[PDB]
Design a protein around this ligand. Structure first.
Ligand SMILES: NC(=O)c1ccc(Nc2nc(OCC3CCCCC3)c3nc[nH]c3n2)cc1
Ligand SMILES: [Mg+2]
Lengths: 294, 258
């Protein structure tokens, strides 16, 4: 089955499995092989990822090329990308990531996210480690092991969801229904982080996360977010911090930027901008596709 | 989130077609019958109740069973194994906490071993080419419900209940798409309970009219009228429960007056 691949080096460990870079001996094509040693049979994370990735075919969604399915092992053959945002931003250490490259990745990521959401998929674990970039200037959503197909309207799904720094206030406050708006929030956080190159809400616990968010955006009340004070994990004792002027939240950002970021980090999931709608934001009027210094 | 409702609806209707089981398959099944399938489905319902599984899970499971059986001929003694593996797959896909494999072995009164359930799971996966995210009558109804004014818990439960019956009988329901059964279901529920019809907004939405749904509506209406007498009864019992507002106890309309 694996005759044609030559392992080259181990890439890392995601939600499940282990990923290796490898090349196809007959074609030349470099691939990421996610290996799943096969208890309880095929893990639901592997079942969702494959079933969902097969449907998601988009230039900004990492592409599943093949599934080599064995009795003891299951292998996912993915298109190979060169690095992750996280690795890149730490490399962008000094330079900083230039606005045009930021705008581009953001535009692309909104594209890949729009497509997921139009295909009833929540990704649920967007964070720089999971966003992969190539040498041509493309960026792509990866690791759909946390993903899930949703229904309309949504019902309750796993509460235990999204890396904490990127996790929406509605998940933190225990809302019984979350939707596509969690992924947009993640992406908001990432946008801020390409800019400042540091995580916008690096909390070490749930209450820590909430408070950091509240310090930045204001403690939400019923006015800014109808329904909040009745949320299972909301507390009347929450300090009431004033909202900051957004220009202070990401100083390098100009008017359109701040505007876009604020709609991505709207508290009220229903008012939070959709990926689709964000594509037409003035922030993007001059969007091109620079290749990054790799 | 109506920001995507229509992208999704359109997609589900493209996908229901690609995900449709072959309408002719039982005729090509040497050893099993519609009747043995209905028994199997009726047991799946029960399993669903016993582990408090989502209705969506049941429907998915069935979908996998029909599609698997569309190319794989199975001996009657093995049909339950297909069904067990399919429910374990549907659970892994759809549920927050899926019942563990042992729980699936157990509910076959150990008709089958762990290893057996798990090699079947692998085989359904291959026959289905991991394509598990199939549209169901459930995903359609749930969209159609958005079109109530005002919403009506009884209608919803009644819709759910009839869509559910439709899983039980391959003849006739294997020749209707999810989207259509759901349509007939919802029209039938709405009418039964409230006297209203398929709203103009769902015509605009789905492009279906009463006229298009008639064929299915006639079948379904008969299934409704005859349900108390069917060989399989698990859905009827399920739908007496307070969670579905006891709608199995609602009397079917005597006529539909189309
Ligand atoms: N930083 C690095 O060193 C690097 C990274 C990633 C990388 N390329 C690549 N990696 C994948 O999984 C990587 C995993 C690792 C752990 C988090 C989830 C993603 C892929 N899955 C599908 N295509 C993939 N391509 C090349 C170099
Ligand atoms: Mg036969």
């Amino acid at each position: 089955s694996m005759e044609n691949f030559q392992k080259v080096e181990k890439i890392g460990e995601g939600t499940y499995g282990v990923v290796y870079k490898a090349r196809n001996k007959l074609t030349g094509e470099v691939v990421a092989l996610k290996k799943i040693r096969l208890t309880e049979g095929v893990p639901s994370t592997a079942i969702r990822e494959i079933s969902l990735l097969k449907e998601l075919n988009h230039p900004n969604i990492v592409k599943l090329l093949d599934v080599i399915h064995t009795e003891n092992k299951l292998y996912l053959v993915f298109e190979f990308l060169h690095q992750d945002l996280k690795k890149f931003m730490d490399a962008s250490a000094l330079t900083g990531i230039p606005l045009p490259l930021i705008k581009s990745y953001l535009f692309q990521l909104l594209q890949g996210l729009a497509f997921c959401h139009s295909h009833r998929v929540l990704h649920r674990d967007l964070k720089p480690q999971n966003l992969l970039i190539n040498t041509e200037g493309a960026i792509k959503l990866a690791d759909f092991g946390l993903a899930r197909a949703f229904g309309v309207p949504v019902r309750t799904y796993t509460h235990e969801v999204v890396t904490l720094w990127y996790r929406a206030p509605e998940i933190l406050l225990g809302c019984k229904y979350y939707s596509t708006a969690v992924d947009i929030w993640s992406l908001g956080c990432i946008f801020a982080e390409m800019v400042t190159r540091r995580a916008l809400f690096p909390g070490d616990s749930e209450i820590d996360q909430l408070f950091r968010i509240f310090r930045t955006l204001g403690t939400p009340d019923e006015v800014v977010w109808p329904g909040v004070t009745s949320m299972p994990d909301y507390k009347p004792s929450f300090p009431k911090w004033a909202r900051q002027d957004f220009s202070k939240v990401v100083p390098p950002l100009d008017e359109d930027g701040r505007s876009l970021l604020s709609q991505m980090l709207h508290y009220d999931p229903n008012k939070r901008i959709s990926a689709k709608a964000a594509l037409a934001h003035p922030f993007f009027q001059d969007v091109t596709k620079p290749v990054p210094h790799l | 989130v109506p920001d995507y409702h229509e992208d999704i609806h359109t997609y589900l209707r493209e996908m229901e077609v690609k995900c449709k089981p072959k309408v002719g398959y039982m005729k090509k099944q040497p050893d099993i019958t519609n009747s043995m399938r209905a028994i199997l489905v009726d047991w799946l319902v029960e399993v669903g109740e016993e582990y408090k599984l989502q209705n969506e899970t049941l429907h998915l499971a069935v979908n996998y069973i029909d599609r698997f059986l569309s190319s794989m001929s199975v001996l009657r003694g093995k049909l339950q194994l297909v069904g067990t593996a399919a429910m374990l797959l549907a659970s892994k896909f759809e549920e927050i906490y899926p019942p563990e494999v042992a729980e699936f072995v157990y509910i076959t009164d150990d008709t089958y071993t762990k290893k057996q359930v798990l090699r079947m799971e692998h085989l359904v996966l291959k026959v289905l080419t991991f394509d598990l995210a199939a549209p169901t009558v459930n995903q359609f109804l749930t969209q159609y419900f958005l079109h109530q004014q005002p919403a009506n818990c009884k209608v919803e439960s009644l819709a759910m209940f009839l869509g559910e019956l439709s899983l039980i009988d391959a003849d006739p329901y294997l020749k209707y798409l999810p989207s259509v059964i759901a349509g007939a279901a919802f029209h039938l529920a709405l009418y039964t309970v409230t006297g209203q019809s398929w709203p103009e907004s769902l015509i605009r939405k789905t492009g279906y009219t009463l006229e298009s749904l008639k064929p299915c509506l006639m079948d379904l209406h008969q299934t409704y009228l005859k349900a108390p007498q069917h060989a399989q009864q698990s859905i009827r019992e399920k739908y007496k429960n307070s969670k579905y507002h006891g709608v199995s106890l609602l009397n079917p309309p005597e006529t539909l007056n189309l």
